[PDB]
C-alpha cells in the first residue's frame, strides 16, 4: 500500500503497531481498522482515534464520560483529527483524514478510547 495503514487491536487489549508514519507527500492519509479476536465491542472494543500528544489525555476522558452508544468519543470534539467508529470482533471500520491536518512540528498520537485502553493501546504517528 502507500497513503493507507492497516491497523488491528485484538482480544488482548493491543493495537499490532505502535508507530505510524504518512508520507508527507500524500493530500490524504487512510487507516483501516479491524478487530482478529472474538470478544464482542462492549468488552473489548476498539476505536482507532488521532490528536495531538497533548490533547490525548483530554480526549479519552470525555470519550469516557460519552459513553458506548457514542463510540467513547466526545460528539463533534474539535480535538480529534480522525476517528472510527468503536468496533468488536470480526467487524472493520476506515477513516480518511486530510494529512493537511497534521502542521509541521506538532506531535500526535492515535488510541483507542474504550475505557482503560489508552494504556496499552496507544502509539505515534509522524510525518514522514
Ligand atoms: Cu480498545
Redesign the pocket.
Known amino acids: 500500500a502507500e497513503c493507507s495503514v492497516d491497523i488491528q487491536?485484538n482480544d488482548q487489549?493491543q493495537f499490532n503497531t505502535n508507530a505510524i508514519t504518512v508520507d508527507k507527500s500524500c493530500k490524504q492519509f487512510t487507516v483501516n481498522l479491524s478487530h482478529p479476536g472474538n470478544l464482542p465491542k462492549n468488552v473489548?472494543?476498539?476505536?482507532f482515534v488521532l490528536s495531538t500528544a497533548a490533547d490525548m489525555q483530554g480526549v479519552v476522558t470525555d470519550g469516557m464520560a460519552s459513553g458506548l452508544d457514542k463510540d467513547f468519543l466526545k460528539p463533534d470534539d474539535s480535538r480529534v483529527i480522525a476517528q472510527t467508529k468503536l468496533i468488536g470482533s470480526g467487524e472493520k471500520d476506515s477513516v480518511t483524514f486530510d494529512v493537511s491536518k497534521l502542521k509541521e512540528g506538532e506531535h500526535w498520537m492515535f488510541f483507542?478510547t474504550?475505557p482503560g485502553?489508552s494504556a496499552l493501546?496507544k502509539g505515534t504517528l509522524t510525518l514522514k
Open positions: 487491536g487489549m473489548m472494543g476498539h476505536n483507542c474504550f485502553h493501546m
